Design a protein around this nucleic acid. Structure first.
Ligand SMILES: Nc1ncnc2c1ncn2[C@@H]1O[C@H](COP(=O)(O)OP(=O)(O)O)[C@@H](O)[C@H]1O
Ligand code: BEF
Ligand SMILES: [Mg+2]
Lengths: 107, 80, 95, 93, 504, 88, 98, 107, 93
DNA sequence: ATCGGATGTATATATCTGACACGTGCCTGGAGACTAGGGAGTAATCCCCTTGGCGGTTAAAACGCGGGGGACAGCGCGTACGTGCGTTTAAGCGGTGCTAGAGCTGTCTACGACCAATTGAGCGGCCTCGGCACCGGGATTCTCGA
DNA sequence: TCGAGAATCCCGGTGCCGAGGCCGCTCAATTGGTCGTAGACAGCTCTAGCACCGCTTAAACGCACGTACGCGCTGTCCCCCGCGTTTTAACCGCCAAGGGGATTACTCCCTAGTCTCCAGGCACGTGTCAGATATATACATCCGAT
């Protein structure tokens, strides 16, 4: 018959068969249900869509058209919940948010 | 062989200026070299443990990444 | 001349704007190799291994200095002192 | 010798979100490491969810519970919504 | 111990051979040795050391008690309530004081509300008796143990249900002649804390006293019967399997006749209608009344689970509030002064009748008693009696000790103008004396009929000279009809057996 | 009269009394306490309880039960890197 | 003239007393009502065990005792002896719980 | 033939066979080697012996003869290495080490 | 329904070290939880050591490396000594 | 405060340039079809253990009060650190060259999964006494006015 | 100023309930086989890591100096501690009902495994423009004179 990928018939962009192979060959459990990789692939695609949208906005603010890790650092550390998720993660070549304490400014 | 003196005074002041420190005392430097040496001892101990387990003699980037993940300081950017 | 506390703030703006490393390469590489001598003799480092160690060490010291700055402002000063760093490592659990 | 990654898939999602924006190689490696990290977190949490109840099969139920355990607040609701939409479209097809 | 074991079997083996069928039915120590030995081989004048007169049936009740002591066995004085079980108990102790000439260490146990009632009638009848009411804090019990209890300077100690637990270690050290327990309902369980302490004291006899027998099961009565004579029975599963719960498999009701025959030389129970002593019985109604229009919404706001966002984990209890009164749910009460008007009877169901009933009874010169299961409901009735300006007293759990005593005699005062008298069920009506009233109302029902039967006979006893008219209030088409019908199922399984043992 | 509606005033976070917080501070080694520690400590304790009870309710709902057992709380505490020994 | 102590002696005696013993320090029924009130927001009609409430109480008391130790270190560092709300805010800011 | 337990072969006291079962049915890897459970049982026996020895000495320091959990708390927190290992673990019914700060003592 | 534990083995080790000191029930539960905790830590580290090198078998060598990754200081040295002595005795017997 | 006065910072223009986006050939891992068997879903049953409320005791919380010890603001002072200039020195860039070791492939072979028969180690249940928990008396220790 | 009232520690007595120890059952560990295959090992390749050299120049080092912040000292004031008295709700026991956790039996359907086929993804060339960088120019920005 005519072949058709599971990523196509589920309406996703991330692969599904690769995630299914990584669940079986990773020794997470003995048997893997046939609805697990669709759900997991949708979750990973959603998180990647969030971070790429925020990093694209941060790159558009500095009038660049490609994404450098500084933009990823800004897009993660400005969000509340993404900073809560990636709370103990060092992004390489990242840099620090601009932050000067109030009592150090001249008066 | 006094290679810890390679972490010079202007480098520590640049690291403090990125942190937000406006004014620095003169006894920060020895304490900072001690803190840096302790942190490097822990991470390189774990990385050499991984390298000796793999029966190699070359410390890859992946071993440093695995050691930093082992201690809790996850690093994104150097493969995996 | 400028007054004390102006060039400091301008350097804070400069070094928080940028992204690159702040410790020179070869002293840090000599330091990493000297610490690695104590564990297994005659090792061999890839370049990205030393780059990973330098990136993580800079992130660690920047986080430590931010917490030290918070403690030193809490004690109604503007000048950090070694007892601030000892407190900041005492709270985090590195004792 | 080949080494697999998530490069082309992140590139597809980027072309859906921002149609006129590229991405450098270091940011591509960071997004690759991010995808692998979140995958390992969710898979490990669902694995010991299946072990804690003496089951032997990761269903979609354990993945939903692991997503509700890990992702904080407003991300959890949209993640559960996206996953339920994907599985519902997949089953009827 | 072993001589009395034969002396117990002097009268047990004088009965039928079911006792031979019970001793040899173990699954047995040297009782079989003294069993096979015997298997092969008064005061009817109302004695006037008391201060007053006895009753001619009570003289028979006294002589049954000395017959148990003459045979050196225990027993149960299970006469119907209101017949004067205290006078039979006091005169039995004065029998040992003036005939057998032994004033000994006696220990009686009562509920807390009835502790003054013993020491009043001891002083009314036998004033030669040294008696306590062991009240007080840890500071006040510190003297009375040290001063007079350890000095052995007493006759009768009147304690309560919880003080006998708090002070077990200064009471093991003194031997006893009797442990006379009024209101034998706390000992209905075998694993209870109070029963575990009572089986450690040293006693000659134990005149266990109750107004009612078993409440729910056969399992309840033997647990009372186990701590009567544990040398004899000492059985849990064997007695349950001997009788098998009123022939639950065969439905014969001819094994029950042996059970009436076991207890008939082992218990005394006489009926208030049999021996009159008031010459006038009681009536009873059940005012099946409907729900008010406000709580019809509140009955809908529970079952559909709509007021909201709270716990409803026991719907049997949550509906039981709304069947009684709406103002218990914290939000039925509308205002910031929570108001004050005729709205209160207007919102409740039973208060519509009770406002009408008391105005029918305040004219007639009646005195009512109001009972309840919930303490917080009597607070609402307290504001209602202030609203109609009625005099009362309110006895409740954890009021005080001496405040209870004052409020009884204020209501039992002659020509007292107190009209209603608020009581609870598990604390108020369990042995107090309220002959000055005539009619009794129950605001709600209970999961035990014998708890309410203990409370209905409060005013219907010796000394009452009026017609007792009991008015139960039941909410129509609600949980109370299910509870009252479930309680009635518990009643016929008991009383139709207790009807037979006195007759045969 | 008007005694029937006089006690609705608990607000169960106020059930963590002032001498209880002082007993906790005396175990912690604190000599002398300010007067504003109490509201802040109640807020901290409420946030901690919200996190742990959220995770325990999630573990309870996944097993299709309605009874939050002790192992659910121990799993929720291990989940946040606060291991509790002594309950299985 | 009665025998009053100077302010601070009873405090140190209580410090030794409560650092010697190991019982719980919050009364059980208010803590249980607190747990049930917080749990009403996540799923209605739950039903706890007793050992679950004991586990939550042990964990919460251990958390608050460690918090007051770190708060005492901060307030001694600021050359005081009095813990203040900014000390607790600092000690939770350094740990990474903001 | 005659059976003999593997713990008596290794001379240990912990069960080797139960550790082998918990590693096979724990889903840690596909195949479990024969030398792993002996080694793991020996390491667990060593750590148990260390904590019980320190708790026995701490119990003897109070003239007690049975180990209450306060003794385990003292024996863990007074050691340095066991404190570094069990640094996150809260022991139930434990208590705190007796430690008053220096400046709070009276002059 | 039975429920296994480590209680009698802990009790045997207690009778080896201190021949007279007893132990309570709550302390026995604490030691049981300790043994399960250290078991899970060492087994997890050994498992992902085997996964990093693309092996498939947990030998004794991965357990030795997991002990040298987890236990600090002199505990690592003494634990490696005890384990190597145990396996060396086991192979010859 | 303001005004010039240096001064650092940002902006617009023009020019390379190497990293990125894109097209191709190949190959291995994903999809389709099929079969077997064992996890798990559901029904039904038992009984433990949870909830709600009252009774009664009493220990702890609340409240008011006096008073002293610490928090805080201000003053002064003195020395330590920021700033800038001139001199040294070592990092950085490129360039070459060597070779040690990571990495792949092929080939046995010891070894761990799987499975059937057998049986004692461990577990639940049930007695039982001794260590720990008070209990009260007596000696010692500590802080507070002297 | 040493004595004086209160707390703590310790000693002997009592008692009580929970750990220690037997006992019977049974199921999971052991033993003895078979077999497919992950890993050990030997060998070859090729690439990236080491070491050295020379040139340049940006950055570190050292020094002076001026000022502003750390630190100590005083005074005031008011907030928390100690304590006694009264209220209130926690604690434990008791009494009901019943809901839901835990178990067992049975059937079924969903996933592991196998074989076959084929296209999506990856390594490999290649054009080409986004951004780095020099270079001139406009504009906020701190600061001494006034
Ligand atoms: N011989 C008697 N003469 C008068 N009153 C009596 C007599 N015997 C008993 N009573 C009445 O009985 C009341 C107490 O009886 P009580 O012991 O409460 O009976 P019960 O315990 O069966 O309810 C007293 O008020 C007393 O007046
Ligand atoms: F026990 Be009687 F009804 F006072
Ligand atoms: Mg009576």
């Amino acid at each position: 018959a005519k072949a058709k990928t599971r990523s196509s018939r589920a309406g996703l962009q991330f692969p599904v068969g690769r995630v299914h192979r990584l669940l079986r060959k990773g020794n997470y459990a003995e048997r893997v249900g046939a609805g697990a990789p669709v759900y997991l692939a949708a979750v990973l695609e959603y998180l990647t869509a969030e971070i790429l949208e925020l990093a694209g906005n941060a790159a558009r603010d500095n009038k660049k058209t490609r994404i450098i890790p500084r933009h990823l650092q800004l897009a993660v550390r400005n969000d509340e919940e993404l900073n809560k998720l990636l709370g103990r993660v060092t992004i390489a070549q990242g840099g620090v948010l601009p932050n000067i304490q109030s009592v150090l400014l001249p008066k | 062989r006094d290679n810890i003196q390679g972490i010079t005074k202007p480098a520590i002041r640049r690291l403090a200026r990125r942190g937000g420190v406006k004014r620095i005392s003169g006894l920060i430097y020895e304490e900072t070299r001690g803190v840096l040496k302790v942190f490097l001892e822990n991470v390189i101990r774990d990385a050499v443990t991984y390298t000796e387990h793999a029966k190699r003699k070359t410390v890859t980037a992946m071993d440093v990444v695995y050691a930093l993940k082992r201690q809790g300081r996850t690093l994104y950017g150097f493969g995996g | 001349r400028y007054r004390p506390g102006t060039v400091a703030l301008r350097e804070i703006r400069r070094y928080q704007k940028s992204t690159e490393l702040l410790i020179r390469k070869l002293p840090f590489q000599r330091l990493v190799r000297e610490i690695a001598q104590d564990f297994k003799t005659d090792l061999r480092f890839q370049s990205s291994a030393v780059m990973a160690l330098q990136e993580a060490s800079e992130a660690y010291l920047v986080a430590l200095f931010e917490d030290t700055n918070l403690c030193a402002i809490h004690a109604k000063r503007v000048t950090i002192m070694p007892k601030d760093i000892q407190l900041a490592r005492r709270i985090r659990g590195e004792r | 010798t080949r080494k697999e990654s998530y490069a082309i898939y992140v590139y597809k999602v980027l072309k859906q979100v921002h149609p006129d924006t590229g991405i450098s190689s270091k940011a591509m490696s960071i997004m690759n490491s991010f995808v692998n990290d979140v995958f390992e977190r969710i898979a490990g949490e669902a694995s010991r969810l299946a072990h804690y109840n003496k089951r032997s099969t990761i269903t979609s139920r354990e993945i939903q519970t692991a997503v509700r355990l890990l992702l904080p607040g407003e991300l959890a609701k949209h993640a559960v919504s996206e996953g339920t939409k994907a599985v519902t479209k997949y089953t009827s097809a | 111990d072993l001589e009395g074991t034969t002396k117990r079997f002097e009268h047990l083996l004088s009965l039928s051979g079911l006792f031979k069928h019970f001793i040899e039915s173990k699954a047995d120590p040297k009782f079989r040795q003294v069993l096979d030995v015997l298997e092969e081989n008064q005061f009817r004048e109302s004695p006037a050391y008391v201060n007053g007169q006895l009753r001619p049936y009570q003289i028979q009740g006294v002589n049954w008690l000395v017959s148990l002591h003459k045979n050196k066995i225990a027993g149960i004085l299970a006469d119907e309530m209101g017949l004067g079980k205290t006078l039979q108990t006091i005169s039995f102790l004065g029998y040992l004081r003036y005939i057998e000439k032994i004033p000994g260490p006696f220990l009686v146990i009562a509920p807390k509300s009835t502790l003054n009632n013993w020491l009043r009638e001891i002083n009314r009848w036998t004033p030669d008796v040294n008696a306590f009411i062991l009240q007080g804090d840890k500071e006040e019990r510190a003297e009375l143990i040290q001063k007079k209890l350890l000095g052995c300077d007493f006759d009768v100690v009147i304690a309560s249900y919880e003080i006998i637990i708090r002070e077990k270690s200064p009471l093991k050290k003194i031997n006893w002649e009797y442990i006379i327990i009024d209101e034998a309902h706390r000992i209905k369980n075998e694993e209870s804390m109070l029963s575990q302490v009572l089986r450690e004291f040293t006693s000659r006899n134990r005149l266990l006293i109750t107004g009612t027998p078993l409440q729910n099961n056969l399992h309840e009565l033997w647990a009372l019967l186990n701590f009567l004579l544990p040398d004899i029975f000492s059985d849990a599963q064997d007695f349950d399997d001997w009788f098998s719960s009123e022939s639950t498999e065969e439905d014969q009701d001819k094994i029950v006749k042996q059970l009436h025959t076991v207890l008939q030389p082992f218990l005394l129970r006489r009926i208030k209608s049999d021996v009159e002593t008031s010459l006038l019985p009681k009536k009873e109604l059940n005012l099946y009344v409907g729900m008010s229009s406000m709580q019809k919404k509140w009955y809908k706001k529970i079952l559909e689970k709509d007021e909201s966002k709270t716990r409803l984990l026991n719907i049997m209890m949550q509906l039981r509030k709304c069947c009684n009164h709406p103002y218990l749910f914290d939000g039925a009460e509308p205002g910031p002064p929570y108001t004050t008007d005729e709205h209160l009877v207007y919102n409740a169901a039973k208060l519509q009748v009770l406002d009408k009933l008391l105005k029918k009874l305040k004219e007639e010169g009646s005195r009512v008693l109001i009972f309840s299961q919930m303490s917080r409901l009597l607070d609402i009735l307290e504001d209602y009696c202030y609203f109609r300006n009625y005099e009362y007293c309110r006895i409740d759990g954890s009021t005080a000790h001496e405040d209870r005593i004052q409020a009884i005699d204020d209501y039992n005062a002659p020509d007292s103008k107190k009209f209603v008298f608020l009581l609870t069920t598990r604390a108020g009506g369990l042995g107090i004396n309220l002959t000055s009233a005539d009619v009794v109302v129950l605001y709600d029902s209970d999961w035990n009929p014998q708890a309410d039967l203990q409370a209905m006979d409060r005013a219907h006893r010796i000394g009452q000279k009026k017609q007792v008219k009991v008015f139960r209030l039941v909410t129509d088409n609600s949980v109370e009809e299910k509870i009252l019908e479930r309680a009635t199922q518990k009643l016929r399984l008991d009383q139709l057996v207790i009807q037979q043992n006195r007759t045969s």
